[PDB]
From a paper:
IRE1 integrates multiple functional domains into a single ER-membrane-spanning protein. The lumenal domain senses unfolded proteins in the ER through indirect and direct mechanisms: as a result, it undergoes dimerization and subsequent oligomerization. The association of the lumenal domain promotes dimerization and oligomerization of the cytoplasmic kinase-RNase tandem domain. The cytoplasmic domain has been shown to self-associate via different surface contacts, where a back-to-back (B2B) configuration is believed to fulfill the essential structural requirements for RNase activation.
The B2B dimeric and oligomeric IRE1 complexes are stabilized by phosphorylation of the kinase activation loop, which in human IRE1 occurs on residues S724, S726, S729, making phosphorylated IRE1 (IRE1-3P) the most active form of the RNase enzyme. We determined the crystal structures of G-9807 and G-1749 in complex with IRE1-0P at about 2 Å resolution. The structures are shown in Fig. 2 together with the structures of AMG-18-bound-31 and apo IRE1, including the first reported crystal structure of human apo IRE1-3P. All structures show IRE1 as a B2B dimer, with extensive overlay of the RNase domains, but some differences in the kinase domains, especially in the conformation of the activation loop and αEF-αF loop. A possible reason for this is the stabilization of the extended activation loop conformation by the extensive hydrogen bonding network that the phosphates on S724, S726, and S729 form with the backbone and sidechains on the activation loop. The resulting rigidification would make the opening of the front pocket, which would require an upward shift of the activation loop, energetically unfavorable, depending perhaps on the number of phosphates present on the loop. This suggests that stabilization of the activation loop in an extended conformation by phosphorylation or binding to allosteric RNase activators may stabilize IRE1 B2B dimers through widespread rigidification of the kinase in the monomer context. In one case, phosphorylations on the kinase activation loop can stabilize an extended conformation of the loop, rigidifying the kinase and stabilizing the B2B dimer as a consequence.
Numbering used by the authors:
A (entry chain C): 560 to 963
B (entry chain A): 560 to 964
The structure:
Amino acid sequence: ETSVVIVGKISFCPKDVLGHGAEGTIVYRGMFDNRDVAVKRILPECFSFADREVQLLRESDEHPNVIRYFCTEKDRQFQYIAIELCAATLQEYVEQKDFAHLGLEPITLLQQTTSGLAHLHSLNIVHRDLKPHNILISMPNAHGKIKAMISDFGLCKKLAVGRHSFSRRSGVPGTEGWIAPEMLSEDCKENPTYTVDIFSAGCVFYYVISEGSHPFGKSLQRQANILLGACSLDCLHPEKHEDVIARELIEKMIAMDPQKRPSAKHVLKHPFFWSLEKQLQFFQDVSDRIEKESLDGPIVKQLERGGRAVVKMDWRENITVPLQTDLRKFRTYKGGSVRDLLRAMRNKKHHYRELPAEVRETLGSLPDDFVCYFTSRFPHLLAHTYRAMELCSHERLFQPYYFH
Amino acid sequence: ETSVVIVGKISFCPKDVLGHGAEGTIVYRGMFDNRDVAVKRILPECFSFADREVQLLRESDEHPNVIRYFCTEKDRQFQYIAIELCAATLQEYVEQKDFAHLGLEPITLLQQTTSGLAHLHSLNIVHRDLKPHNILISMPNAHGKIKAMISDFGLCKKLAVGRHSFSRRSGVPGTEGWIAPEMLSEDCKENPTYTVDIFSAGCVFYYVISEGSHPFGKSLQRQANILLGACSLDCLHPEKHEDVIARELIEKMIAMDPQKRPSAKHVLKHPFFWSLEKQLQFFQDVSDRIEKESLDGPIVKQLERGGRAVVKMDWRENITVPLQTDLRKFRTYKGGSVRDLLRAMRNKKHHYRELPAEVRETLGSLPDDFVCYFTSRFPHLLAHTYRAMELCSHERLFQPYYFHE
């Protein structure tokens, strides 16, 4: 014996509470136009944040990683918002053990979230409240695939025409512990901009790949640490190639100086999101680019600057012995040079098919095992080379690797 | 002095008629929940196609190139379907002289249309009535960009579970001039399948790049020619690289035999959609692949088979003089070989920076002008190489270039 409430085209069962939240705002499992939806019941006082959210949703929900908005209805005492029904929040994705990823891997989730975020920014919309609770996991589609979506637009702001910034005139919106420092800093001269989302996104990034941690500590001390700048990314191991590239992006995203933070579209171009195949191609491209470069040139000098730590003093001593044996027929490849390590990688990639069976065995298959053969042994190689080769970032060859 | 009709959440002004449909259905411009939408008004006799269209749209509209569905209201007299308001049809995009592309190239439009179609097929839905009139051009977004979309699902066919075909017992749903020949064949033992859409898509493909022509002539005898098999692609010149690749795909899409037609996802992997950079990368990849291949091996033999026409007897006599001079010392490159033409290309690509200014000038910059230097002088090179190298299509290296069912 269960009851049903109907308000215009929106209907729901009061027993199917999906969760509470803000100002006693309750979310029910509901129905609209014969499809399953989530229904947000809004209190009379929050008709402001609802009228804001609903309008901003109309303008940007077409993007696949922005929650789909269906309808809204006005009652005698309440306002109702019908949006796409989702399976879980990102917090459940990260913290629930044995969670069905269903093809949705952490980096892809982050890529999707950033895509949705980039979409909002292209529409001059700043979110200002990006957090694991606001990032939803979709229901499985007909092919069993799931995706990530940005939601909860009640605190979003449409930037005024001609402005790339906004003021904290409407106080400080957001949830404690995910707020950009320049939002609370009283001495802050620069008006906050899109980068407040980038900061929060950064914390979310670290939160996902660390499987639950936060760059600025535990619940109560987070926001205090943020204003202090006391971040700690010690779940990212310094000798792990994946963690190294992850740290390089994350520490830029949560940088204390807002102008130093990469835009959403810039973030999407980072090696963090590169496949193994693209990584090897970058390695090949830089090798060919520096092949006829002089050793005293700005490029090679930049590439070898701090190179000893990258090659671990002698890279010919840190590879497997069938590869060492294959390389003694060359010997022009100096073990103290990053340039020669890259030359040897390119050479062995190019002639791979012609290589002896036993050296193709230690290298592994092209291109995935091959590139991991080196990155796992030289975890700073990609980061270092990527940074150093920024001098060539305007060249046509290296356009898809950098942001412009 | 204008009137407003309000049905539930759907509202529209009767004066704003956007167009007419089949059997009394009229489409007005209107509003739904402060969204600018299109509104289909449907008669009680066509409630069948309505609830069908609604259902299928309540499944497959989750794609950028499939029309968005918002809501349906039912009246005392009519039904109302609220869908995304678009700016134009493909017919108006093509036939209206000086139609503002607004950043929408013809090929991208064909890529978008095919993607939307592939989405429908993945959901076991056959459109059966694909045509320029129901391929829609979106309203410009905030950035002023537009896209193409598939619409008009009233005649769509949801295949039964476990079925990959459907019977013709309903008759001939398609529009004359875009109907696959197996739909109007008295003999065919084979039930129609997804490929009826591919045939229509092929006709649309050629319709766009020819800027108004049809593979089977003018409207008066199109369908007649379709049954005859009298296709004609006159607008595609036999010695132009772009047209040679375009012809190769279109001829397979409008093939008389349904089984010969490529699936929508297969279509998307065709060189027709390859960027200039991807074309050059493909040339480089097969060049590196056949470098240590035996000259008597299956791969090289396939590649040289018909090579004379490809390289125009001797490619060294069909390239520019500054390049001739720079390649003269390379006696290892045999002028009658397709493999060696690809080798010279890969070599000049790899050493491009080291090349003297004069030869870099005739080649042009990497990669755009460079690849066009060769495809324009050898219009069949890519088409020939792509077809020949299908022997290696199952290999990891060439998987992104080909399709695997």
